Design an enzyme around this catalytic site. Structure first.
Site, PDB file in Angstrom:
ATOM      1  N   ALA A  88       0.833  -1.193   0.000  1.00  0.00           N
ATOM      2  CA  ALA A  88       0.000   0.000   0.000  1.00  0.00           C
ATOM      3  C   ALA A  88       0.871   1.248   0.000  1.00  0.00           C
ATOM      4  O   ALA A  88       1.733   1.419   0.868  1.00  0.00           O
ATOM      5  CB  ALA A  88      -0.926  -0.001   1.213  1.00  0.00           C
ATOM      6  N   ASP A  89       0.645   2.120  -0.974  1.00  0.00           N
ATOM      7  CA  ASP A  89       1.406   3.347  -1.125  1.00  0.00           C
ATOM      8  C   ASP A  89       0.677   4.495  -0.419  1.00  0.00           C
ATOM      9  O   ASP A  89      -0.285   4.275   0.326  1.00  0.00           O
ATOM     10  CB  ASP A  89       1.646   3.621  -2.616  1.00  0.00           C
ATOM     11  CG  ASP A  89       0.361   3.687  -3.414  1.00  0.00           C
ATOM     12  OD1 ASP A  89      -0.725   3.618  -2.804  1.00  0.00           O
ATOM     13  OD2 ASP A  89       0.436   3.810  -4.654  1.00  0.00           O
ATOM     14  N   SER A  90       1.130   5.723  -0.656  1.00  0.00           N
ATOM     15  CA  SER A  90       0.642   6.909   0.035  1.00  0.00           C
ATOM     16  C   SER A  90      -0.881   6.965   0.110  1.00  0.00           C
ATOM     17  O   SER A  90      -1.462   6.891   1.201  1.00  0.00           O
ATOM     18  CB  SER A  90       1.185   8.147  -0.680  1.00  0.00           C
ATOM     19  OG  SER A  90       0.718   9.351  -0.103  1.00  0.00           O
ATOM     20  N   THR A 134      -2.500   3.876   1.782  1.00  0.00           N
ATOM     21  CA  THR A 134      -2.433   3.914   3.240  1.00  0.00           C
ATOM     22  C   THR A 134      -3.384   4.959   3.813  1.00  0.00           C
ATOM     23  O   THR A 134      -3.970   4.752   4.882  1.00  0.00           O
ATOM     24  CB  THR A 134      -1.000   4.187   3.699  1.00  0.00           C
ATOM     25  OG1 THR A 134      -0.566   5.461   3.204  1.00  0.00           O
ATOM     26  CG2 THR A 134      -0.057   3.088   3.222  1.00  0.00           C
TER      27      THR A 134
END
Ligand SMILES: *P(=O)(O)OCC(C)(C)[C@@H](O)C(=O)NCCC(=O)NCCS
Lengths: 135, 49, 50, 72, 134
Positions: D33-35, D38
């Site tokens: 999960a990226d920016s 998340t």
DNA sequence: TGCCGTTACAATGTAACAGTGG
DNA sequence: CCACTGTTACATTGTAACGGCA
């Protein structure tokens, strides 16, 4: 116009409306003769996979009575279809006892606002009491 | 300043609405992605054009 | 044989292209709408937290 | 329960397998999960338990174990 | 048992319900083979104007999984049919915007009351506040 | 348990009012 | 003026979930 009109969707809606009305037994056709009415209904049935031709079939054999109901039902269906995207634009159906609804409708007509607005005002006064109790 | 508290509550309700919409959309997108494991998504669905 | 193979190939091409154009459009619309809604949501989050 | 409601949220917000999401599974490196992913994960965690979290204390959360630790 | 059950009425209700479901595509019968299903549906169609035999038709060919849905549909139909005689027992249906409904349902679940009771209480509290101010 | 009333919805159809632009 | 559109307030039917009672 606030809601985009899509031709290939509204045409299918109209065809489904015609078929539902016919199978319910109503006389969608403008014809009093049995044979022409049966032929027109059969042609409409053939038009299942060609919603575009449904507009022409409407202009050719639609009962003059049903234009208002048509323009009402498809308009409402368009509104509902576009509102269903987000929860905050949806509508919720509830049933009310006759006394409660009578009092509520009298109150709303007194204040000159819709039922949802009246409920908002009532729950907001209750929540104001709760807030001042909380502070 | 109870009026300011009511304003905070109104903004809180609006933010709850937006967050719920966003989270529901994200969950639906994730479900679709897990359902497109058949490898029809690499280029055929996500057309960046 | 030529007729049958041409009919099948045309059916395949038409179905594939139409299905892709039908689905990918709403898919990308959903993606863009989700991004825009997140961008809007962050501001309300920050102001509410303040 | 909370310790499995957290998995319910994480798996369906990141799309990763239930087996993948262990207590120590970090979101960014393990779950990927990226920016924005998340961000949506923390928003969903807030929604599930109908609570709110501070910005800094929330961003400090970067793992399933940390997620539950702040949740429980 | 609060509402007396009338056979010639509820049986017509059941026949109409089954015909509606068949026209909607629902599988009325328990026969997977299409021939038997069509034969049973034809028996039902020609079975119009008969309570004592539509009951037997249901007992013999009715799809097992639709029994509960039909039973509760007939329950609701009976209650509504008997309540629609007098104004005070009728029910008024309205549509509420989702935020308003959400708040109202929150209150109703919190207090354990129904929507009608919750609205009654809210109107009464509004009246009491009016009297306090006035 | 199974029937029986009851509630809270969902889906669709309509009438009436309010807006909007040609 | 006139038509077309959006919205609200119902009705109508169906269904799932509770809870009472033999
Ligand atoms: P990702 O690398 O796209 O990063 C997204 C983000 C962390 C920058 C974003 O989700 C975010 O947090 N934006 C707001 C940052 C902030 O604290 N602003 C103050 C309130 S508006």
């Amino acid at each position: 116009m606030k809601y985009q009109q899509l031709e290939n969707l509204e045409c299918g809606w109209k065809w489904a409306y015609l078929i539902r009305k016919h199978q319910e037994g109503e006389p969608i056709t403008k014809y009093i003769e049995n044979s022409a009415a049966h032929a027109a209904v059969d042609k409409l049935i053939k038009l299942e996979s060609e919603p575009v031709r449904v507009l022409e079939w409407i202009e050719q054999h639609m009962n003059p009575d049903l234009f208002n109901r048509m323009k009402q039902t498809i308009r409402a269906r368009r509104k509902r279809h576009f509102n269903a995207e987000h929860q905050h634009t949806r509508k919720k159906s509830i049933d009310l006892d006759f006394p409660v609804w009578h009092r509520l409708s009298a109150l709303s007509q007194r204040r000159g606002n819709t039922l949802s607005e009246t409920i908002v005002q009532l729950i907001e006064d209750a929540e104001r009491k709760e807030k001042y109790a909380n502070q | 300043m109870e009026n300011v508290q009511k304003k905070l509550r109104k903004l809180e309700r609006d933010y709850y609405q937006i967050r719920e919409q966003v989270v529901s959309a994200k969950a639906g997108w994730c479900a679709v992605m897990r359902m497109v494991k058949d490898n029809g998504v690499e280029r055929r669905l996500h057309r960046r054009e | 044989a030529i007729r049958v193979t041409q009919s099948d190939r045309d059916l395949f091409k038409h179905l594939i292209t139409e299905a892709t154009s039908y689905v990918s459009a709403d898919y990308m619309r959903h993606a863009n709408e989700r991004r825009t809604h997140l961008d809007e949501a962050l501001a309300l989050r920050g102001e509410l937290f303040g | 329960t909370i310790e499995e409601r957290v998995k319910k949220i994480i798996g369906e917000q990141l799309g990763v397998k239930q087996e993948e999401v262990t207590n120590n599974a970090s979101f960014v490196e393990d779950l990927g999960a990226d920016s924005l992913d998340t961000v949506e994960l923390v928003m969903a965690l807030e929604e599930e338990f109908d609570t709110e979290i501070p910005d800094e204390e929330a961003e400090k959360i970067t793992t399933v174990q940390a997620a539950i630790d702040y949740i429980n």
